[PDB]
Design a protein around this ligand. Structure first.
Ligand code: E8N
Ligand code: E8N
Ligand code: ZN
Ligand code: ZN
Ligand code: ZN
Ligand code: ZN
Lengths: 327, 327
């Protein structure tokens, strides 16, 4: 009956309009602490995040799910500060992404389960802030360690009811192996969002996942390097498909009967140290609306394409609440 | 005229008997903060380190150089606590080892130089504690990023006078490429210790480095899996050469005229999360003396083999002071 946020438990009705895959800062463990000048300063990063979340709140957003893990450099004290100043709920994540250090990569499935359970059930570091989601990742066929991470995420979710959300290389159909591993541990697909699924146009892949009961994360809608001229690093990161092409996948899944299984987000950030220098400036030039892009641009676009206000409210309010509520 | 420690500047004469390659904890960035239970508890790790350093101090040690970097999970607040409780000076390190995260691996040589200079000239995180050595690493041919790290370490040392110490795969003669890169930046070999050099018996490699002026780090003397039965992970980490075989390299370099260029250490730790679970228990069974192994076992061994007290005092007191004193 309660979702954990960086400011404590909230009721399901308090979540409201929820972006289910976002980041305050995409970094690495300990990096903001050791090298804040990379972001100008910690205070500058806080100010940029607060301004952005305030603009998102003005556009209707009430909650974001920050799916930054330990190895994305999640700083829940930073999240708590930004959430208080902007009056936007923030759900924090446990799990591991694609850059775990040796001290994680050498661990067993049982050890990883203990760590994920620590952050869900006890707290993150010494903050008492508890994670409300488990984030995992593959980029193609799972490494042996990533198989353990997926299994540990399933075990932590089975013990707590907290959902799992994934990073995929969608064009490699990673979600199929992720699903197989999750189901081998007994995890219900209704507890799992297969993310970055808007990175592919393969409807046979997307509907294969949705038919089994998975939630489908169409979470990078504004990610596009169309127009960026001669920027190889931005094109490799953002792709050459338009935001409209990504957004139309929302309509496609609605038209196939999966409106209750769609989760939509921007996968935006306010600082970004785990990629090339100045990528944040490039991304901000692509999408000045930042996290407000979903309510300000995507929802009107889909309404114009014939999607009802009621269905879009179900996707942005009802589905995230059903997903995040521990079950 | 001063060496920076985790408790502030000390005079050269205060350093005394110095172990030049040690670790309080071999971990990963943020790991002790996020998962202290891996070590039992933070307090248990502190207590184990204080007991060990007190036993080292009783055996004659006055200073250790903790060559844990950012990506070894260096916690200078932990080092400061242990150094105060044990009355042993601890010199902290900057640099990067073999497990840098994406936020480091994507950086330029200029950016890395800024980061190393930050930790030497300003402070580590928000602690005001300044590093007194720069640690770098290769395992075979340098990766492109490791080339940048070596160059940035050279630049930081050229600006500050602080020395550089390296991790090598000694049997692959890494020190030769490390030397080439350092010298291409104008760094004096007298500011560089090529470490893990006791991992090889190749005198042609060791003397090639010493002839150019490098300091030679014979820093893992008690590392041996001889006697360990059927432990593949311990054998891969520690090797099958005896501690006596490693220690006799000290005598070999003395006999070749390099007594002033030898640095000796244990490469010991009190916690170790970046390898297999329970490796610390295995290592402690191999060498119950821990960091006291050099004064309690190696120095008497070399005296029995004909090395003078005066030469061993030069190696353990004079050489570390000459190396660490900024120049
Ligand atoms: C909201 C109304 C229901 C549809 C039209 C699907 C029938 C989607 C938009
Ligand atoms: C101390 C005295 C000098 C030697 C014998 C090298 C001549 C080493 C031991
Ligand atoms: Zn991702
Ligand atoms: Zn993301
Ligand atoms: Zn090493
Ligand atoms: Zn070491």
């Amino acid at each position: 009956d309660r979702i954990n946020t960086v400011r404590g438990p909230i009721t399901i009705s308090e979540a409201g309009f929820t972006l289910t895959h976002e980041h305050i800062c995409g970094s690495s463990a300990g990096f903001l602490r050791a090298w804040p000048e990379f972001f100008g300063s910690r205070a500058a990063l806080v100010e940029k995040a607060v301004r952005g979340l305030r603009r998102a709140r003005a556009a209707g957003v009430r909650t974001i799910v920050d799916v930054s893990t330990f190895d994305i450099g999640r700083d829940v004290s930073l999240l708590a500060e930004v959430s208080r100043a902007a009056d936007v709920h923030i759900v924090a994540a446990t799990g591991l992404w694609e850059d775990p250090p040796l001290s994680m990569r050498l661990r067993s499935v049982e050890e990883l389960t203990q760590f994920f359970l620590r952050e869900i059930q006890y707290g993150i570091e010494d903050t008492g802030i508890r994670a409300g989601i488990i984030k995992v990742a593959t980029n193609g066929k799972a490494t042996p360690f990533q198989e353990l991470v997926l299994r540990a995420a399933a075990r932590a979710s089975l013990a707590t009811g907290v959902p799992v959300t994934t990073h995929t290389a969608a064009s490699q159909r990673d979600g199929e192996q992720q699903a197989a591993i999750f189901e081998s541990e007994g995890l219900s697909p209704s507890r799992v969002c297969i993310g970055h699924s808007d990175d592919t146009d393969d409807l046979s892949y997307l509907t294969a996942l949705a038919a089994r009961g998975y939630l489908i994360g169409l979470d990078g809608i504004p990610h596009s390097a169309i127009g960026l001229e001669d920027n190889a690093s931005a094109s490799a990161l953002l792709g050459n498909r338009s935001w409209q092409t990504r957004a139309l996948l929302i309509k496609a899944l609605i038209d196939q009967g999966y409106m209750k299984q769609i989760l939509v987000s921007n996968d935006w950030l306010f600082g970004f140290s785990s990629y090339v220098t100045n990528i944040m400036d490039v991304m901000d030039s692509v999408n000045p609306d930042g996290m407000a892009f979903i309510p300000l641009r995507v929802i009107p676009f889909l309404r114009e394409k014939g999607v009802s206000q009621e269905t879009l409210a179900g996707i942005t309010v009802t589905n995230p609440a059903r997903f995040l509520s521990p079950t």
